[PDB]
Design an enzyme around this catalytic site. Structure first.
Site, PDB file in Angstrom:
ATOM      1  N   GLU A   1       0.818  -1.210  -0.078  1.00  0.00           N
ATOM      2  CA  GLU A   1      -0.085   0.026  -0.017  1.00  0.00           C
ATOM      3  C   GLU A   1       0.857   1.367   0.017  1.00  0.00           C
ATOM      4  OE1 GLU A   1      -2.951  -0.451   3.202  1.00  0.00           O
ATOM      5  OE2 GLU A   1      -4.377  -1.470   1.905  1.00  0.00           O
TER       6      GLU A   1
ATOM      7  N   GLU B   1      -5.707  -8.358  -1.107  1.00  0.00           N
ATOM      8  CA  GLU B   1      -6.388  -8.191  -0.020  1.00  0.00           C
ATOM      9  C   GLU B   1      -7.743  -8.242  -0.238  1.00  0.00           C
ATOM     10  OE1 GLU B   1      -4.992  -5.343   2.977  1.00  0.00           O
ATOM     11  OE2 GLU B   1      -2.832  -5.922   2.485  1.00  0.00           O
TER      12      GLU B   1
HETATM   13  C1  LIG Z   1      -5.810  -1.072   4.612  1.00  0.00           C
HETATM   14  N1  LIG Z   1      -4.935  -2.117   5.366  1.00  0.00           N
HETATM   15  C2  LIG Z   1      -5.820  -3.459   5.191  1.00  0.00           C
HETATM   16  C3  LIG Z   1      -5.372  -4.112   6.680  1.00  0.00           C
HETATM   17  C4  LIG Z   1      -6.857  -4.586   7.335  1.00  0.00           C
HETATM   18  O1  LIG Z   1      -7.836  -4.425   6.736  1.00  0.00           O
HETATM   19  O2  LIG Z   1      -6.877  -4.920   8.387  1.00  0.00           O
HETATM   20  C5  LIG Z   1      -4.675  -5.713   6.506  1.00  0.00           C
HETATM   21  O3  LIG Z   1      -5.448  -6.349   5.905  1.00  0.00           O
HETATM   22  C6  LIG Z   1      -3.425  -5.381   5.724  1.00  0.00           C
HETATM   23  O4  LIG Z   1      -2.505  -5.391   6.976  1.00  0.00           O
HETATM   24  C7  LIG Z   1      -3.061  -3.847   5.078  1.00  0.00           C
HETATM   25  O5  LIG Z   1      -2.243  -4.155   4.132  1.00  0.00           O
HETATM   26  C8  LIG Z   1      -4.463  -3.251   4.606  1.00  0.00           C
END
Ligand SMILES: CN1[C@@H]2[C@@H](C(=O)O)[C@@H](O)[C@H](O)[C@@H](O)[C@@H]21
Ligand SMILES: *[C@@H]1O[C@H](CO)[C@@H](O[C@@H]2O[C@H](CO)[C@@H](O[C@@H]3O[C@H](CO[C@H]4O[C@H](CO)[C@@H](O)[C@H](O)[C@@H]4O)[C@@H](O)[C@H](O[C@H]4O[C@H](CO)[C@@H](O)[C@H](O)[C@@H]4O)[C@@H]3O)[C@H](O)[C@H]2NC(C)=O)[C@H](O)[C@H]1NC(C)=O
Ligand SMILES: *[C@@H]1O[C@H](CO)[C@@H](O[C@@H]2O[C@H](CO)[C@@H](O)[C@H](O)[C@H]2NC(C)=O)[C@H](O)[C@H]1NC(C)=O
Ligand SMILES: *[C@@H]1O[C@H](CO)[C@@H](O)[C@H](O)[C@H]1NC(C)=O
Ligand SMILES: [Cl-]
Length: 605
Positions: free
Chosen positions: A152, A269
């Protein structure tokens, strides 16, 4: 309320079915140097025990914080890979592969990817890493790995690392060249973000533009390798919303970047709801498990059966915390049992994890199937749906199979009072020796360790006995093998709960019995308890009833619920666990495979 009709045609094998969902992932907590704790060792044992390689990849954040340094840019720079070796070995031991995000600062060394010397150092670090693990595991193994960008990049998640737009592109080129210097066979993709509408997500769209048309930092060459495009899109509690968002982004990529028309797309994800640690009751039980199956069905039926979608990862390998052992987005439910001497950890298999074992019974060809109510045809964008598959045999340890996975799911909503009448008409079954069928069923009434926990009063530190009670709800309810009727038809009228999952497995009898259980190991939990875990790599067929475990302090069978999960917690009422263990497969025709090598265990008081 007319019944749902589910028709399946086992003669009409339509096209390949790819098991595109065999991924999970997680992030270690703050500070960034957990992944080598007993908790994580147990967690990955549970992830790898999903049968028939049902989970393959564990996408893990902050891997390059497991690398430390000595010296400096001007003094002479050295890397200590010890901790990274530990985690990767641990994955390897469980027949898992890392989703290898090139993510971290090597314990504070890297600070600025617009600094020319640092970009060069990164390239060489990446190459050193890749060559190291090529040496350690073989090129065939490492070339299966999805190397990936930092997670991200448009979410500003960089610690004390300056990563501007230009810095991200330099970083990418260093990743790409570093891997290439080790071997052209190695795969790299990115960016692993949302791809919101411009001007949003500048680093995500920027990376695509750079790889399509920009110039390589090291070679000056126009265009840079990009083997897959990874996005993140979650449902906000809607299942079909995930696919709808994916299609918008995929279409924008197709038109704007014609060189990427065939470039595989990953949603690594693909979760129902952002925020893993937020307690949600639906995350605890079959509500979440059935929704995960529905999402997958939707993807197979409404997308792949034409954008190049290749991977879907439910990011649920996190470890839960008090006071929400079940209600977080996790495959297991962790209990930190602090009141023994010494403290210990126990994990329970949650339904979502168990469902991955049902998905794993799907084979390599999709069968024609249709769901309808009162004559109206219903696609997977509805509360009831299906995925049906068939297996083409080769060996004499192998024979024809069909697997029919039906779901009843209203996304995050459970309906405890409702019953859904379903008529499954399976026709077209080819003739074969000893045709039998087996059902496996999951719902919140019968197979919810969370529900057992609540019935027991939510003990914070459950007793051994409470743990046995809870684990008795891990596996699906299985009906023993019944011969198929003559003529190659099968009609069943199950009443499904909402949520529920039902797998109907129809198997022909292979000439030879199952193969040998391998890699048996015994792992201590606490006085009087251990985990047994093994591999089904050489077992052959998926037409398995259970694994028979035997214990010797003459070998005696250990009585237990039927289970094809490649892991068992042994917590006898007497505490007697010292001796030898052996395990074998038992197939649907009551034929045993050969025992594993014995494994001794001597408890130390
Ligand atoms: C935006 N965040 C989500 C987060 C979550 O939703 O808890 C989890 O899946 C990951 O660690 C992150 O990379 C993404
Ligand atoms: C048995 O023994 C174990 C230790 O061996 C104890 O385990 C700890 O339990 C507590 C919960 O009671 C845990 O505390 C929680 O930690 C979460 C994660 O912390 C890390 O990551 C976050 C975010 O990624 C960072 O912000 C943070 O600095 C850490 O690096 C927090 O997210 C939790 O916070 C939530 O609830 C609290 C209220 O309690 C709020 O403050 C927050 O706003 C938030 O909504 C929480 O703080 C702790 O992490 C556990 N430790 C370990 C080692 O796992 C058990 O508590 C103990 N059992 C009993 C019953 O006493
Ligand atoms: C899945 O089904 C839903 C219906 O529940 C579809 O969404 C609807 O689309 C209409 C018109 O296209 C819109 O006015 C509504 O916003 C939607 N209705 C509801 C109740 O949400 C959706 O298009 C379907 N998705 C797919 C991929 O087939
Ligand atoms: C590398 O790190 C490990 C773990 O911290 C340590 O035990 C080992 O001795 C280190 N090696 C060197 C050469 O510093
Ligand atoms: Cl979720």
């Amino acid at each position: 309320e007319a019944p749902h009709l589910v028709q399946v045609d086992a003669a009409r094998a339509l096209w390949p079915l790819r098991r595109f969902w065999r991924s999970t992932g997680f992030c270690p907590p703050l500070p960034h140097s957990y992944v080598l704790s007993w908790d994580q060792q147990l967690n990955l044992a549970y992830v790898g025990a999903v049968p028939h390689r049902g989970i393959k990849q564990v996408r893990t954040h902050w891997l390059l914080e497991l690398v430390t340094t000595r010296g400096s840019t001007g003094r002479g720079l050295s890397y200590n890979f010890t901790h990274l070796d530990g985690y990767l070995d641990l994955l390897r031991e469980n027949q898992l592969l890392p989703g290898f995000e090139l993510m971290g600062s090597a314990s504070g060394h890297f600070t600025d990817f617009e600094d020319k010397q640092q970009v060069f150092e990164w390239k060489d670090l990446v190459s050193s890493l890749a060559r190291r693990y090529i040496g350690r595991y073989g090129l065939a193994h490492v070339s299966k790995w999805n190397f990936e960008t930092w997670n991200e990049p448009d979410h500003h998640d960089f610690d004390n690392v300056s990563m501007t737009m230009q810095g991200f592109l330099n970083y990418y080129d260093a990743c790409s060249e570093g891997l290439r210097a080790a071997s052209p066979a190695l795969r790299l993709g990115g960016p692993g973000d949302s791809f919101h509408t411009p001007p949003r997500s500048p680093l995500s769209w920027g990376l695509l533009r750079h790889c399509h048309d920009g110039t390589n930092f090291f070679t000056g060459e126009a265009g840079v390798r990009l083997d897959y495009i990874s996005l993140h899109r979650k449902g906000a509690r809607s299942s079909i919303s995930i696919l709808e968002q994916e299609k918008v982004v995929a279409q924008q990529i197709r038109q704007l970047f014609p060189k990427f028309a065939d470039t595989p797309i990953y949603n690594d994800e693909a979760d129902p709801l952002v925020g893993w640690s937020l307690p949600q009751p639906w995350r605890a039980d079959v509500t979440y498990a059935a929704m995960v199956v529905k999402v997958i069905a939707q993807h197979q039926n409404l997308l792949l059966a034409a954008f190049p979608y290749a991977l879907l990862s439910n990011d649920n390998a996190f470890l839960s915390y008090h006071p929400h052992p079940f209600a977080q987005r996790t495959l297991t439910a962790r209990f930190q049992v602090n009141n023994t001497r010494p403290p210990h950890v126990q994990l329970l298999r949650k339904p979502v994890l168990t469902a991955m074992g049902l998905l794993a019974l799907l084979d390599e060809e999709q069968l024609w199937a249709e769901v309808s109510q009162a004559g109206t045809v219903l696609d997977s964008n509805h509360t009831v749906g299906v995925l049906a598959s068939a297996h083409r045999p080769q060996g004499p340890a192998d024979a024809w199979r069909a697997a029919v996975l039906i779901y009843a799911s209203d996304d995050t909503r459970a309906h405890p009072n409702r019953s859904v009448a379903v008529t499954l008409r399976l026709r077209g079954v080819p003739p074969g020796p000893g045709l039998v069928y087996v059902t496996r069923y999951l719902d919140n009434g019968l197979c919810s360790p969370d529900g057992e926990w609540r019935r027991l009063g939510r003990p914070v530190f459950p007793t051994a006995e409470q743990f046995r009670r809870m684990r008795a709800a891990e596996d699906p309810v299985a009906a023993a093998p019944r011969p198929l009727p003559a003529g190659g038809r099968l009609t069943l009228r199950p009443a499904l709960r909402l949520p529920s999952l039902l797998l109907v497995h129809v198997c022909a009898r292979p000439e030879k019995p199952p193969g040998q259980v391998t890699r048996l190991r015994a792992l201590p939990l606490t006085q009087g308890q251990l985990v047994l875990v093994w591999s089904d790599e050489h077992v052959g067929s998926k037409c398995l009833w259970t694994y028979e475990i035997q214990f010797s302090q003459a070998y005696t069978p250990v009585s237990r619920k039927p289970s094809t999960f490649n892991l068992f917690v042994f917590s006898p009422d007497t505490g007697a666990v010292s001796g030898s263990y052996r395990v074998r497969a038992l197939d649907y025709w009551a034929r045993p495979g050969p025992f594993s090598d014995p494994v001794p265990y001597l408890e130390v008081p």
